[PDB]
Amino acid sequence: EQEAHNKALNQFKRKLLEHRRYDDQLKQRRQNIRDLEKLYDKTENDIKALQSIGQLIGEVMKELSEEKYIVKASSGPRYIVGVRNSVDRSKLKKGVRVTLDITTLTIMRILPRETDPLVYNMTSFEQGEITFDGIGGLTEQIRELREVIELPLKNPEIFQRVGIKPPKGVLLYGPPGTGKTLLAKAVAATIGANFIFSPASGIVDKYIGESARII
Amino acid sequence: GDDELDQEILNLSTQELQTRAKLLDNEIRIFRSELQRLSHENNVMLEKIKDNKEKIKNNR
Amino acid sequence: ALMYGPPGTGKTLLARACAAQTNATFLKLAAPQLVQMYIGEGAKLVRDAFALAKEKAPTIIFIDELDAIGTKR
Ligand SMILES: Nc1ncnc2c1ncn2[C@@H]1O[C@H](COP(=O)(O)OP(=O)(O)OP(=O)(O)O)[C@@H](O)[C@H]1O
Ligand SMILES: Nc1ncnc2c1ncn2[C@@H]1O[C@H](COP(=O)(O)OP(=O)(O)OP(=O)(O)O)[C@@H](O)[C@H]1O
Ligand SMILES: [Mg+2]
Secondary structure, three states: OOOOOOOOOHHHHHHHHHHHHHHHHHHHHHHHHHHHHHHHHHHHHHHHHHOOOOEEEEEEEEEOOOOOEEEEEOOOOOEEEEEOOOOOOOOOOOOOEEEEEOOOOEEOOEEOOOOOOOHHHHOOOOOOOOOOOOOOOOHHHHHHHHHHOHHHHHOHHHHHHHOOOOOOOOOOOOOOOOOHHHHHHHHHHHHOOOOOOOOOOOOOOOOOOOHHHHO | OOOOOOHHHHHOOHHHHHHHHHHHHHHHHHHHHHHHHHHHHHHHHHHHHHHHHHHHHHHO | OOOOOOOOOOHHHHHHHHHHHHOOEEEEEEHHHHOOOOOOOOHHHHHHHHHHHHHOOOEEEEEEOOOOOOOOO
């Protein structure tokens, strides 16, 4: 050393480190409460759903009277049910899904439409892609195919000039292996419009009458 | 650390560093106080998650 | 891969021997059992035999006798 008063700074260096080490414990704890904060909210949201109850969906089958509506439920049997002042008469039309309670059966709100669990599986097929010329020599068949398909879809407006009925529907036929499904995938990709891709037998059900409902 | 060492005998007088340590007395008693304040709070919060989570466990 | 030839040639026995030997998952499936008169859910037996298989991939779906769902007509 330099001094025997450097024996007194040996002890004072420690105090300094302690003070710069308790500040980082003060940042530790402010990070520890905000980590527990989210865990309270993650369970607070579950409380709020839990002390609530479910809704049971209907749709407006027919208007009867001001405060009385006839619905046909998605589970089946028709009811007459009431309305809160949480919905308007000018905000209801038929085939519009409505909520009901499962403890009083009264509409509180307007509900968007429903759509099959089955048809969402078809929009998740898009693989098997190929380019716009992806069938060799059958490129002529692509031209025939788009005249019904791609051109009026994009612009109906040039077919007003022609004056004919709106083009609809095509049959592909030929022995197996000729890329009928491949041509299907190729006109799905290139147009890029919403696309399904329905299995023949994933639109059949055991019950004869649900098989009709899907399509 | 950066202060109260053999570097700062050269630069600054030695009663300066004598009095430094007694200001770090005053400053670290405040710093320890606030550390326990934010410690006591987390023990209550943990219990209020439990009170919520018990309900969730019956459903579970 | 198709196996074919007269009855008794050894086809079934191979299939078992190799799938267990290399440790590729061997699903045991018989063709008429997919034909059920619950059809739509019996057609969903077919769907689920692929559903299992895509999680249990790679996997070998050995269908014994393919003239019920391999019909000409
Ligand atoms: N006409 C074709 N030109 C080029 N490649 C083809 C053609 N047809 C089939 N392929 C190739 O064969 C693959 C599988 O054939 P795909 O499943 O399209 O058969 P398909 O005979 O059209 O079906 P289906 O028997 O159900 O009508 C394609 O992904 C593609 O690689
Ligand atoms: N190369 C071989 N070496 C030893 N044993 C054999 C051989 N080939 C066939 N076998 C014997 O003959 C038996 C009959 O063949 P297996 O039943 O396996 O096939 P298969 O043609 O699918 O008949 P099936 O459809 O009538 O059941 C085998 O189980 C085995 O005992
Ligand atoms: Mg056999």
